[PDB]
């Protein structure tokens, strides 16, 4: 489906490409295969991201990466890519709003769930290759709000920083007040506990 | 990782150095040599700098800003505008012109910063190149007053004549390819 859409959206195929024209245009790779080149990259990239956030043609797991310095757009539909969900930031305002959390709060008898949040475009899944092209805010309120200017172009926000820890490290209380090797040791000891 | 900046040198210490000494490895990971200066050279920093220059390997590639291989049929023609003056001065009383002049020219520009840092002399470099390749290379060097340090190299005039009636059609490397090989060898193994 992605290849069909790319053909619709003014992507010249490698076979039809004059060799001279490649130099000034971005190369579009889909699953590691150089499909073609596109003369205007940013419009295509925005359209692909809109489609993924609406979940129309591009599934949520599909990751689009643009390397601006190297003039390459890479789209991976491959399996095995590890992804984490991140909130989406437009302008400097989080897309998640009080109406969304009000619907989620009454999750029972409203049939509003995480899938509705993904479909609404509030959250998105981002793999590491796409993480390289993403400006993230650890905490929304602190980093998004205007201060002495550090970054005014945040594109995503972390849901909560404590989610970087795994199952066994999540039982540690006050992990940030411990030495690191000690958290590593507790992760191993907690597997051997009795209960 | 947790040595100090006081050493100001790469030093292998700890278990890896113990293994190097225990196994008596032919090649240490960081071979080093501590040189103690005999007399006034130890007292004065400048004299120690002289000794350093004597002890540190220096090649033409380190002091060469850029190299260009030109084709100039006539040395008097001076295809490069800049070398007109000193080529004319040298050919006012030309040397080795009687044998011939090789048309292909190798022009080497030497960075003044590196040249003065190692305290090398243009005449010194010319002598070293002349000694290394014998008479097969003829070198022309600018005066130090010139803003750009230029060394002009041509194939041997006798070799250009071939000094042989048969002349042999082998034509090994012609002259341009031979000049490129000469440039690579000079840069890598000049040992000025």
């Amino acid at each position: 489906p992605i290849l069909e859409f790319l053909e619709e959206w003014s992507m010249e195929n490698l076979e039809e490409i004059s060799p001279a024209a490649i130099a000034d245009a971005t190369k579009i790779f889909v699953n590691g295969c150089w499909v073609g080149i596109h003369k205007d990259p940013e419009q295509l990239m925005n359209t692909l991201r809109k489609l993924r956030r609406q979940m129309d043609i591009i599934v949520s797991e599909v990751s689009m990466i643009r390397d601006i310095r190297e003039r390459e757009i890479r789209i991976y539909t491959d399996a095995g890519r590890i992804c984490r969900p991140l909130l989406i930031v437009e302008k400097q305002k989080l897309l998640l709003k009080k109406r969304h959390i009000d619907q989620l709060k009454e999750r029972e008898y409203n049939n509003y769930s995480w899938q509705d949040l993904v479909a609404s475009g509030v959250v998105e899944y981002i793999d590491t290759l796409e993480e390289e092209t993403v400006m993230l805010a650890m905490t929304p309120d602190d980093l998004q709000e205007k201060e002495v200017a550090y970054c005014s172009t945040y594109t995503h926000c972390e849901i909560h920083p404590s989610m970087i820890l795994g199952v066994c490290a999540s039982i540690i209380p006050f992990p940030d007040h411990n030495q690191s090797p000690r958290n590593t040791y507790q992760s191993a000891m907690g597997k051997q506990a009795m209960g | 990782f947790h040595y100090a900046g006081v050493s100001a040198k790469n030093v292998t210490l700890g278990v890896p150095r113990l293994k190097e000494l225990i196994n008596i490895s032919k090649k240490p990971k960081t071979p080093s040599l501590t040189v103690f200066l005999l007399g006034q050279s130890a007292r004065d920093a400048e004299r120690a700098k002289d000794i350093l220059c004597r002890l540190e390997h220096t090649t033409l590639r380190k002091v060469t800003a850029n190299t260009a291989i030109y084709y100039d049929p006539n040395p008097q023609s001076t295809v490069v505008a800049e070398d007109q003056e000193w080529v004319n001065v040298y050919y006012e009383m030309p040397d080795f012109d009687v044998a011939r002049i090789s048309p292909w020219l190798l022009r080497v520009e030497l960075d003044r910063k590196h040249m003065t840092d190692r305290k090398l002399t243009m005449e010194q470099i010319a002598e070293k190149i002349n000694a290394g390749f014998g008479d097969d290379l003829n070198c022309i060097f600018n005066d130090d007053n010139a803003e750009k340090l230029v060394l002009r190299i041509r194939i041997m005039n006798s070799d250009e004549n071939k000094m042989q009636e048969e002349e042999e059609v082998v034509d090994k490397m012609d002259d341009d390819v031979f000049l490129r090989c000469i440039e690579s060898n000079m840069l890598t193994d000049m040992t000025l």
């Binding site: 030495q179 690191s180 | 990782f1 947790h2 100090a4």
Partner: peptide
């Protein structure tokens, strides 16, 4: 975890 000269 301390510094460059110390320990990690």
């Amino acid at each position: 975890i301390w510094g460059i000269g110390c320990n990690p």
